[PDB]
């Protein structure tokens, strides 16, 4: 069963040394280097973990984090994508900082975009269809991207001088990139950035009762539209640590 699997893995993790994580941290494509700065790190490889590419537990800005350096729906299962989020909850995390590499639609290269909301165009919902024992059939998604966290994110960014934009992320399955016409359609539907992750993790986070901060790093426009990537990367690492201090 799902819950039985959730326990086996939480116990293996706890015995390995995963004590009391406060935030889950999912590092997107190109954003993995911050895991190297986790102190007193416990490094466990994905293949080594039961029912489950590295897992890192340790200290970052002095916060205990369980960092993922991720599964995607396009690799083949919403269950494997979101199982890590269930584990974060089961180990006692209070929130999720989920990040990704996104194609720009409302924003160009260099943008760090904190996620205000999302659109699920993956064709799948990770809560389908067994979760009965959680007793939470119809999660409300109106504050999935915790307003309070986004407020903290902006306050920190404003203080320390890192530009932090804000907008809507549309999640699709991948793995092929979207065509120009698709991106035009997604703009019409209100999307500011697109990518192949995050939406399923966030839906599960909400069902889990987890608070969530979403951050998209935008290196490239999406289809139809020098280094920026070193700047992106430096800003990201600085902004994320500074946020963790007071999250």
Sequence ranges of the domains in the chain: 1-247
In eight-state DSSP terms, residue 31 is -
Cα 234 to Cα 182: distance, rounded to the nearest angstrom: 31
Domain 1-247 = CATH 3.40.50.300 = no
The answer to whether the annotation marks 178 as part of a ligand binding site is yes
Question: Can you read off the two tokens belonging to residue 95?
Answer: 């929130």
What's the maximum distance between 2 C-alpha atoms anywhere in the chain?
51
**Nominal resolution in Å?**
1.8
The answer to whether the annotation marks 220 as part of a ligand binding site is yes
Cα 155 to Cα 164: distance, rounded to the nearest angstrom: 10
CA 65 to chain centre: 13
The answer to whether the annotation marks 101 as part of a ligand binding site is yes
DSSP string, 161-218: T---EEEEEEE---SSPPPHHHHHHHHHTT-SEEESSSHHHHHHHHHHT-EEEEEEEE
- Per the listing, tokens 């990770």 go with 126
The answer to whether the annotation marks 71 as part of a ligand binding site is yes
């Amino acid at each position: 069963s799902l819950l039985k699997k959730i326990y086996e893995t939480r116990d293996f993790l706890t015995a390995k040394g995963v004590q009391k994580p406060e935030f889950g941290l999912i590092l997107g494509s190109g954003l993995g280097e911050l895991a190297e700065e986790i102190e007193n790190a416990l490094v466990l490889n994905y293949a080594d973990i039961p029912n489950w590419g590295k897992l890192i537990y340790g200290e970052l800005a002095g916060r205990k984090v369980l960092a993922l350096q991720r599964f995607h729906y396009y690799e083949g299962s919403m269950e494997l994508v979101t199982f890590p989020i269930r584990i974060m909850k089961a180990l006692g995390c209070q929130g999720l900082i989920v990040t990704n590499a996104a194609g720009g639609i409302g924003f160009g290269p260099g943008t760090l975009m904190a996620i205000s909301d999302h659109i699920n165009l993956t064709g799948a919902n990770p809560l389908m269809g067994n979760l009965d024992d959680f007793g939470f059939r119809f999660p409300d998604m109106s504050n999935a991207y915790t307003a309070d966290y986004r407020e903290v994110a902006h306050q920190v960014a404003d203080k320390i001088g890192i530009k932090l934009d804000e907008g809507v992320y549309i999640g699709v399955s991948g793995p092929s990139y979207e065509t120009p016409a698709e991106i035009r359609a997604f703009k019409t539907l209100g999307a500011d950035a697109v990518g192949m992750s995050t939406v399923p993790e966030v839906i599960v986070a909400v069902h889990s009762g987890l608070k969530v901060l979403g951050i998209s790093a935008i290196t490239n426009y999406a289809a139809g539209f020098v280094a920026v990537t070193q700047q992106i990367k430096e800003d990201f690492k600085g902004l994320v640590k500074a946020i963790l201090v007071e999250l």
